[PDB]
């Protein structure tokens, strides 16, 4: 059913200049100061190649530099047409770790909407998004890291436990198990559950919640909250926006 | 409505020394070394103009340097004479607070935070400073609306919210401003525990009573050493500044500051170096 | 209806002479059990006992082919049936901070530290449970409770600061300041327990997550202990954590040609 | 012969109850005097001292035409001629750490604050000194020395952290371990001291570092010296800086409409 | 003289796919593994526009990608031809915030060689580099941010204190005083003064014997040193290293 | 030779307990609290092997328990027999060490590094993180080796280096691996004196017992104070350790671990809650 799908498609319209991308998609709101940036490769469980972070870069440097727009929806189209299962972002198949800067970095709120598997690189971006909603349904979070000799010792572990804690952080990495949206709710990594066919719905609600307040001072208030864990690197970000004004 | 109101009257006197109080309240527990400090501006949601700042900082440095008071009770007085609504503090009066922020923080007594109704902008970020908060059930609101008055506080109210929510919840907070109750914040961790509104401060009084059975000096050194890493340097002053205290009264620092006046060596013999 | 199932665990060769502690290695799994043995006394530790523990961890840290240890207390108590994992302090070197050493030791080996909260974690007791890695506790019988303040003592490291990493800044503070009692189930709601299991399950499904944490790459858990303390460890932190970086140069390439 | 020129200055109103300290703002530039009025005893600071100070130091923060103040020590001895800035503190809650808040005081005060070592700087006074945004010193007179280890006392505070931020790890541990005199030369190679000035035009040379200071926009000053405080305050630090940050968006557009 | 200029032409060649820069010049060492970045607009003091900006930091990019070069040379040319003066950079005339955190990020060692004036942003990108050599005839050091409202309170500010301690980098920020390369030798800000005519050749000599240690000790060691006032950042980059062995 | 050696014989005792040290030598001085802890290869540069760090371990450990001992001197025997030539340390013995610093960083001791010839590679770091370090103005050779041998200390000796000399000297160092003499180090901030080679021990004593005339448990909370920050939890639990400490000994801890066994009610009454 299209109607079951997360994808509501009255309410995107494809951004001009992006007609070449292939692993990834990138809609921009009919009315609402909002994206949606998804990875496009269902097949593979949105799996990214070398090719799908150059194109997630490029889209999202271009929505950072988009002065109209205040919230960036990260997601992951499905299903796939191979199985009918569900996935974000199953994880690996420039670098990745640029793309979470960027998310990190960019002075707008990024929201991750987790439609289904969460997994190594994918489950690394979900932490690094300001704020997550998952689909309770077919959210699946694991975190694949310490299973191969890889492992995220950056923002896709050590923030975790700033959200989460150092225990059940410990906890998720250690023993890699799976979890469902409303577990990952309970320990604080999931801002909130919603019914899989309203995760972007919800998305929207959020995204459009956030753009009705002062740009500036949401601006103000990311780095405020990133400053924190990222030194001077944080530092410079909110000073930066503090010589603005 | 008196029996339901928050307050009650005989466990409290007046603090001496503040019946020019206007927009705030200040009492003295009649038994335990706790004191009540109340916003007093119900008919406006206890918003806070200059005045009022002025007095909260004059109130709760007064109990800071109060050698028998162990515990500080904030909360709003209520309910408002207009409508009969709840508020502990709705933040600045749209007609420095950080400076109270500081001395909530800094003062070696807990404060708790009961919140009685909304918490909103400077209100919300009251809340979020004090060491321990407790709220109405029925009535306690939180809603953090810096974001869209323009406004924002990106210290304490916001960065430390994290430190007690997580980073994910804390973002959320401040970038929907949406309205939360006492249950959903507890859920969260900015909130302690939830009680019913008319035993609010009842119950405040037990965890208050609870609190200074305890060592003073325990609980003095203990809130430092939470505050400690947050707060850098200025955390490590506090803590150390406990720690130098300390050694002050040992018989180590007492040899050393008899020998100076004796104009005598000092005999570091009967003092082991510690491992 | 004990938790400790004999048949698991072989008694770990050269510590015939322990006393307050007792030290086995699995049958099996890369993985030991270290508990206190004081239960007439609510396993409270005696100057002996952070000795021994002290040295038992030290061997397990050194231990090539332990990956987890599980840290819990023996029981019940002979004389009242209660069950504790360890009460704290029993109640001129003596003034030695050697509690602290063995907390800097569960922090720093690496290796994944579970404690198996089976009864009463107090005082010093709760400080241990706090600074290892994970925790699994006894729904019918984990108590928590820090008491340090009652007597006028306090755990300013990692026995408060640590566990505000883990509730947050709010709960810490309460459960510090008012000193009360809670459950297994309270405790993992608030962020402290990784997990409740039943009383007589509890070491069953500890064995369950160290043989889970020890099938993966030893080398890749090693890494991700030191990335997590590294937030809070500052320079001994970044230390380790380096130490564990060069630990892999030296197999390398660069590093071969070259030295 | 002495640093001070009674024709620059005004005392100021309201503190001609002043006994221990004395309080001067310049006849033209928007700089205050602040200085321990204690001579014959080497401007030691006893409870009333800090009591005074505390008042002197929050009027001059909250003083909107003042951005500078200069922290010094009137002299010399009558005693005996010698000159010293502050000797530190004079050898029932008469156990208030008061110094401590004026530190505080002139690290959070947005204004900045130079000190002017005209003679010893020890103890509590040489951690005053360290705590300064600036230091300039006497090349004939300053005398810097950290005692507080002697009397088995110690800042471990700005007083000694702060001072490895400013000569670095080496030399801070070496002026407090040793607890040896260094001159203003010798602290200005470590990295304390900013300059060294000849005696007579200490004051001078202070004056034309605080012109320089106020020439610039004061809104700038206060941002940049809460930028350097976020670096070692933590979240106090943050709270400060923010705090000015909203400063201007207070009187910005987004900040009007919506309001 | 051409003798006397810093440049030595045959020592260097131009870097394939750069001939459409005009404010930035790029060069690649003949035989080490060095690069050569300045600014080209001595006529005005090296000041940068927001087109110096973009090729600024499309030329440093390139160079974080070349795999065969492990040292960055960052200088500006001159003398002006309009007034013979020397300028490294004076400053503004993407955002300059990206550059500097390019310099900060990239896994190579970035060598700032001030031949004249390093004002305002100039001095600040001074300030991030790893390593700072000065023309002991012409370099000048100024943070002229204080006197106009701006003020670089990231790395151009807070990094300062890391490098000469915090008296100093306040005096430098607060009072804005034009500083010599031995004067800022001694704050600890500058590694070394060199003749103005050798200023290029010492750094080349620096880049050398940086480039004959092992590259991959290099990185880490770079790494290791940002880690600590970059906060969770640093720790990404320094993880990012450790899983690549 | 003899009395040019750096090595005041007359000054120092062999420590009881360690005749079988083959690696290092460890020494008592005849009157101070001061101990010699010394690498003992010369004839190859002081390297240290397993075996060495093992020794080297054990020895400050032992230092660290000494009750009397106040203050620790770590540096190199020699010259080298091979060739006259001087060292500390040159590091590995190209055929745990990390330990060893930690110990170093966390001893309530003052470590003193004497530099007396080369200090390179691991011998370089070992010098970084003692707290003081004097050096020979003729032989005291420094030299990061590590990135040369595809090695690296991405810790204390490298990180740790830049909270000494500053983050651009501290790149330099590691990057170039250049040699540098004791001035030039003293000049960048990691070497606080250069003293003449055969009077390095002596000045080193001479700073040991100014260091030992003053309170020992002052000069303790000095040096984690200044660990603490850059130490993180690590530093506050060693400086909240020494705080837990002087509480123990107060009469307000003392009458709540005396009401405690009387099985009655703790009295804080006596204890003001100071501010
Ligand atoms: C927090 C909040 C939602 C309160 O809930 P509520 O019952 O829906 O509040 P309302 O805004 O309808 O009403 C209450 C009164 O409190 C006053 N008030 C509350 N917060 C205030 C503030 N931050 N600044 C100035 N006045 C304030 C209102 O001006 C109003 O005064 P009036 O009735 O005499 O005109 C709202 O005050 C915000 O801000
Ligand atoms: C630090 C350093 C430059 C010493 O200065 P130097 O006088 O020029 O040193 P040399 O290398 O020529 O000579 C010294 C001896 O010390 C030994 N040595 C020094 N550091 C060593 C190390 N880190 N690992 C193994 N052996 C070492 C050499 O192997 C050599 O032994 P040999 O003469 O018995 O063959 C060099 O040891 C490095 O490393
Ligand atoms: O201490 S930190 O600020 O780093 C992380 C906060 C610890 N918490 C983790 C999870 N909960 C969030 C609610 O489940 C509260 C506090
Ligand atoms: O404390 S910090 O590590 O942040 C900075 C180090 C302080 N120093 C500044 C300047 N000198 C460098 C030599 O002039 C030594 C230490």
Same mark, same amino acid.
């Given at each position: 059913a299209l109607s079951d799908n /997360? =994808? &509501? !498609?009255?309410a995107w319209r494809l951004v001009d %200049? =992006? &007609? @070449?991308?292939t692993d990834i998609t990138y809609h921009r709101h009919v009315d609402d100061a909002t994206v949606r940036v998804a990875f496009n490769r269902p097949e593979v469980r949105n799996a990214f190649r070398p090719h799908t972070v150059d194109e997630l870069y490029r889209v999202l440097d271009h929505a950072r530099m988009?002065?109209?727009?205040g919230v960036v929806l990260l997601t992951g189209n499905g299903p796939? /047409?191979?199985?009918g299962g569900w996935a974000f972002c199953s994880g690996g198949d420039l670098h990745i770790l640029e793309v979470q800067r960027l998310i990190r970095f960019m002075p707008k709120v990024v929201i991750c909407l987790v439609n289904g598997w969460a997994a190594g690189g994918g489950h690394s971006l979900h932490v690094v998004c300001d704020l997550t909603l998952a689909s309770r349904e077919y959210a699946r979070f694991k975190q694949? @890291? !310490?299973?191969? %000799?890889? =492992? &995220? %010792? %950056?923002?896709?572990?050590a923030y975790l436990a700033r959200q989460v804690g150092q225990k059940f952080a410990r906890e998720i990495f250690f023993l890699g198990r799976t979890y469902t949206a409303e577990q990952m709710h309970q320990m604080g990594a999931v801002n909130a559950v919603a019914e899989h066919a309203e995760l972007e719905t919800v998305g929207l609600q959020w995204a459009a919640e956030i753009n009705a307040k002062s740009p500036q001072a949401q601006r103000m208030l990311k780095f405020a909250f990133n400053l924190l864990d990222d030194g001077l690197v944080g530092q410079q970000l909110f000073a930066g926006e503090a010589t603005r004004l």
């Open positions: /997360p =994808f &509501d !498609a009255k %200049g =992006f &007609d @070449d991308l988009s002065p109209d727009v796939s /047409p191979k199985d694949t @890291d !310490a299973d191969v %000799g890889s =492992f &995220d %010792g %950056g923002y896709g572990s």
